[PDB]
Amino acid sequence: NLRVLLDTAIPPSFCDTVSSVLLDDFNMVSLIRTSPADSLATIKQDNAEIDIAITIDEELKISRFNQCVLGYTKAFVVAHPQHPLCNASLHSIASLANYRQISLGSRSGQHSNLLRPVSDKVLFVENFDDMLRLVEAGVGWGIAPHYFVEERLRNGTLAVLSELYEPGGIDTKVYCYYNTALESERSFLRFLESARQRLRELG
Amino acid sequence: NLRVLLDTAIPPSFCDTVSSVLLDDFNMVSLIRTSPADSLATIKQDNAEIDIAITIDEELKISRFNQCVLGYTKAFVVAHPQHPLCNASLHSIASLANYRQISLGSRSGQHSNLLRPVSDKVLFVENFDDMLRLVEAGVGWGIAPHYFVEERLRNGTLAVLSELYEPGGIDTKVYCYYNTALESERSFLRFLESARQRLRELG
Ligand SMILES: N#CCc1ccc(OC[C@@H](O)Cn2cnc3ccc(Cl)cc3c2=O)cc1
């Protein structure tokens, strides 16, 4: 009985080639979604008995778990096309700390260095859809995975601000936190390669 | 009079296409090398009057400076080919926290989350050459830029441990910390693109 956690920032499609692989080796496989901001909070609860977590969030050592890199995914800073900072200049990008940010909140109330909001003017939400609702309505700017803002960008309903900061979008590591048991377990190594293979393709 | 800081982790070659560009626009251009672990410590000293810093080190806001991404470079965990952990398994990689690490030290004595040593058994050095001296002699393992360990790897004098953690080597962002003045300054934007172009090629 394997239990896998995937945060909202992982493409849902990524699951496709992965869950096939696990199911070839494991007979029961449970899949769980959390906010990127709740992933690590969740695996630390011992009763949660999570075996593997795929998440963008980073911490330097979780008691029962080793860490490794599955690959990279792109996220963008986005606002209402006629947001003040729409011109996307370097002065614009510096000033994100002053303008209202739509951030993912956390059960634990606390945030990693990676996921903490950057502005004093913050408005917390439980998922990216809620976030992008308020960003379309010009309530604030937010940062969200490619696969969320892909549609709304071509539709002209949202504008990118991030390009002069990180051209091509903000590259962000997809980490795999795994219960120590699964080191020297050919099942997990089998998963690890196909998972990497899969996430290279989505690039 | 421009003053640019490049840490040891930046390929020396990167300077080539860059310093040409700056010199087309700026008439005096001073180039300074520090340890990655001293880069940000240095620019914070006000008398240091650094205008631009190219460094792998990360912090969330430095008073007088904005941040952006120039691109990505690869670093590897390396040891003596017959180091205990030479087999490079996931149990090996987890155990790096127990075996002696050769780390870059810092004037400020303190380290960023990114650059802090991961093991209790640490031996500090001022540069990568000193580091790789002691790692060849099996004194410990260390992590160093590609361009340092490139030679010693083909020569069989050093072995990679990092592959099952991050296949292809540990991708690490090259950041550009720049004095706020240089936002809305076509000279700097001119530098910013060629710098990105240059560092894409070195990939
Ligand atoms: N232009 C610009 C640069 C810029 C980048 C990040 C900025 O802050 C966002 C922070 O609130 C927390 N953060 C950071 N990196 C993430 C990566 C991926 C994903 Cl999916 C979510 C996040 C995320 O929430 C601000 C400015």
Ligand SMILES: N#CCc1ccc(OC[C@@H](O)Cn2cnc3ccc(Cl)cc3c2=O)cc1
């Ligand atoms: N196998 C394995 C995974 C692993 C990665 C880093 C590990 O820790 C190194 C730390 O001491 C501080 N660090 C982190 N990332 C760096 C990136 C580039 C460069 Cl050039 C230097 C550094 C660096 O010194 C340990 C294990």
